[PDB]
Design a protein around this ligand. Structure first.
Ligand SMILES: C=C(/N=C/c1c(COP(=O)(O)O)cnc(C)c1O)C(=O)O
Ligand SMILES: [Cl-]
Ligand SMILES: [Cl-]
Ligand SMILES: [Cl-]
Ligand SMILES: [Cl-]
Ligand SMILES: [Cl-]
Ligand SMILES: [N+]
Lengths: 377, 249
């Protein structure tokens, strides 16, 4: 029994050991209660405005689109405190933890952004935060935190006989219900602001909104408020790694099969006999073998289209934004920008209004990009 | 077949409980796993619970997680596990054989086809570790269609709704971590699988009203300690299983 539907079509669910169902049911009930509580919404809004820095800017990119009929805006989640969109929903989940009378936080992280997001939120709200399997390491320790697909398996292990005291801060729109729903609702101000901002600046909805997809939280955050606007295209960009043809990628939604893992039924990269494969991307934040079930659902009904961008395309978009707009983007975000640049360049007389979710800043990536550039020459 | 029912009817006639060890298939290797399993049966295990190596064993503790890497370090695949199972059943016609699975290995190439393969090799039950009873319908149904008992975990917190669901949905045995309400609800005989490490705990579970006890990690422990000593592995396994089963009589 649940209050909300755990599935998006055939995708989603709560595929966890029986012993974790009370934790998931507790969390879902607290979330449903919190969404109807004006005091909770006001406290979350306070944190987002006065601590995280919302609303984030919407930046027009005239230098990049000169000589084409593309108008390009970047939704600037790179300007959010912490440097990425992850901060939005850790603030909400930390408030939910406190609503449930809990005082410990468990988390994991690939690109460090979510682990540092979990640590900063825990420091602000007085929660004892413990992170599994993460520079980023020193930040989390500075912020008082006690410190991989298996990373996602590290925390569930503790949250087992812990949830009476601790909350598992899942970092993307995936995992067992209610997390795909909670993470969407705590990220949807991305798309809500973008819609208001585009309307103010252009007097019309975008032709398409474009976001990179790892587990799916920044993309579903951007998409959610546009889903019922049937003329707005929703484009999610998975990592193509060295190329889909190489098998060294992170694009299960396109090139993968439905399976059951990490508490959800969803497309995943897996061997012929159902072992969960290892993904690959130049960007640690997209290096995820599955995808959130709402993206699988949106794909299946044709509401959203999913594409892939290779390491080299992402690298070129990273350089392009640095040189022509003075913004250093996360390599994750550069996948979304790269696809927008392709939409523009392939059809330069097509009139189109595009928004790219610039999910984070790329200071974390400057060492990685420097080594690749130097190794090239 | 009705191996679990025949087993519990016989154990009741003898006024004793069941002792059921768990081991990971192919740990440390196919050959020695097969010999380990024959030693457990030789020593007096009433049923078996056998794990198929999975890339991400979410619901396994530290000792169990090591068993799976040992098996992967040996190249063990699910197809090799099912040939093992057919060989085990061909040697031992009446002992109940339960599998502890992860959902993706069951769902991968079709749920019905997985339980069909279980019936073909003579498996008696399947516990899917990451499928809660609320998600279990297609698994339970496919299990029952192929004469496989779907096993459910009754956790310590279980309220009355979960108790009646577990009692209604499970067959073969109830995986316990409560006994009176399961009997009241006509549940499958309960096997305590929580911290079963000592012969006293077996005797304490039967005395509590359980039909027996499952030792889900103590056997795996004894294997981990004697890797460079295969012979002493089997002799240590034999002595422990004998001590646990004697505690059931
Ligand atoms: C996985 C992480 N971050 C991923 C990430 C992603 C991919 O995660 P989502 O698909 O959930 O947005 C996108 N953009 C940025 C800036 C990111 O850091 C992490 O920091 O643990
Ligand atoms: Cl519902
Ligand atoms: Cl409200
Ligand atoms: Cl409005
Ligand atoms: Cl036999
Ligand atoms: Cl049956
Ligand atoms: N991914």
């Amino acid at each position: 029994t649940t209050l909300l539907n755990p599935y998006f079509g055939e995708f989603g669910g709560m595929y966890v050991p029986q012993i974790l169902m009370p934790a998931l049911n507790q969390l879902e009930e607290a979330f449903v209660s919190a969404q109807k509580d004006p005091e909770f919404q006001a406290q979350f809004a306070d944190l987002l405005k006065n601590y995280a820095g919302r609303p984030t800017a919407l930046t027009k990119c005239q230098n990049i689109t000169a000589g084409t009929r593309t108008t390009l805006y970047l939704k600037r989640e790179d300007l959010l405190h912490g440097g990425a969109h992850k901060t939005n929903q850790v603030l909400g989940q930390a408030l939910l933890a406190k609503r449930m009378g809990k005082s410990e936080i468990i988390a994991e992280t690939g690109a460090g952004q979510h682990g540092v997001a979990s640590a900063l939120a825990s420091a602000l709200l007085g929660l004892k935060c413990r992170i599994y399997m993460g520079p980023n390491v020193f930040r989390m320790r500075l912020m008082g935190a006690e410190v991989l697909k298996d990373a996602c398996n590290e925390a569930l292990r503790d949250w087992s006989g812990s949830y009476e005291t601790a909350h598992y801060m899942l970092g993307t729109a995936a995992g067992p219900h209610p997390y795909p729903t909670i993470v969407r609702e705590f990220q949807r101000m991305i798309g809500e602001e973008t819609k208001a901002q585009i309307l103010d600046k252009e007097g019309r909805l975008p032709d398409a909104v474009i976001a990179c997809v790892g587990g799916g939280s920044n993309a579903i955050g951007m998409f959610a408020d546009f889903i019922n606007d049937t003329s707005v295209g929703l484009i999610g960009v998975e990592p193509g790694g060295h190329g889909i043809e190489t098998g060294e990628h992170g694009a299960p939604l396109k090139h993968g099969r439905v399976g059951i893992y990490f508490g959800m039924k969803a497309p995943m990269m897996q061997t012929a006999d159902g072992q969960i494969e290892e993904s690959y991307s130049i960007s640690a934040g997209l290096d995820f073998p599955s995808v959130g079930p709402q993206h699988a659902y949106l794909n299946s009904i044709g509401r959203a289209d999913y594409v892939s961008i290779t390491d080299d395309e992402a690298l070129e978009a990273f350089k392009t934004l640095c040189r022509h707009e003075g913004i250093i983007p996360a390599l994750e975000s550069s996948h979304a920008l790269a696809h927008a640049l392709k939409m523009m360049r392939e059809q330069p007389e097509k009139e189109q209004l595009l928004v790219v979710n610039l999910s984070g800043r790329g200071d974390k990536d400057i060492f990685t990009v420097h080594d690749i550039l130097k190794a090239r020459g | 077949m009705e191996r679990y029912e025949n087993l519990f009817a016989q154990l009741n006639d003898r006024r004793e409980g069941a002792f059921v060890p768990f081991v990971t298939l192919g740990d440390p290797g196919i050959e020695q796993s097969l010999k380990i399993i024959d030693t457990l049966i030789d020593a007096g295990a009433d049923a078996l619970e056998l794990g198929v190596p999975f890339s991400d064993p979410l619901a396994d503790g530290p000792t169990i997680q090591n068993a799976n890497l040992r098996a992967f370090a040996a190249g063990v695949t699910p197809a090799q596990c099912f040939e093992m199972l057919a060989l085990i059943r061909e040697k031992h016609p009446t002992i109940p054989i339960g599998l502890l699975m992860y959902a993706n290995l069951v769902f991968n190439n079709g749920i019905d086809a997985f339980y069909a393969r279980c019936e073909q090799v003579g498996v008696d039950s399947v516990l899917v570790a990451d499928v809660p009873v609320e998600e279990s319908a297609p698994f339970r149904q496919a299990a029952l269609r192929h004469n496989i008992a779907p096993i459910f975990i009754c956790p310590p917190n279980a309220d009355d709704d979960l108790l009646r669901q577990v009692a209604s949905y499970g067959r073969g045995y109830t995986y316990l971590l409560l006994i009176e309400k399961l009997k009241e609800y006509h549940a499958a005989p309960a096997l305590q699988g929580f911290g079963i490490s000592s012969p006293e705990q077996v005797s304490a579970a039967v005395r509590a009203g359980a039909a027996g006890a499952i030792s889900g990690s103590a056997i795996v422990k004894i294997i981990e300690k004697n890797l460079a000593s295969p012979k002493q592995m089997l002799a240590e396994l034999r002595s422990f299983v004998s001590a646990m089963k004697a505690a059931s009589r």
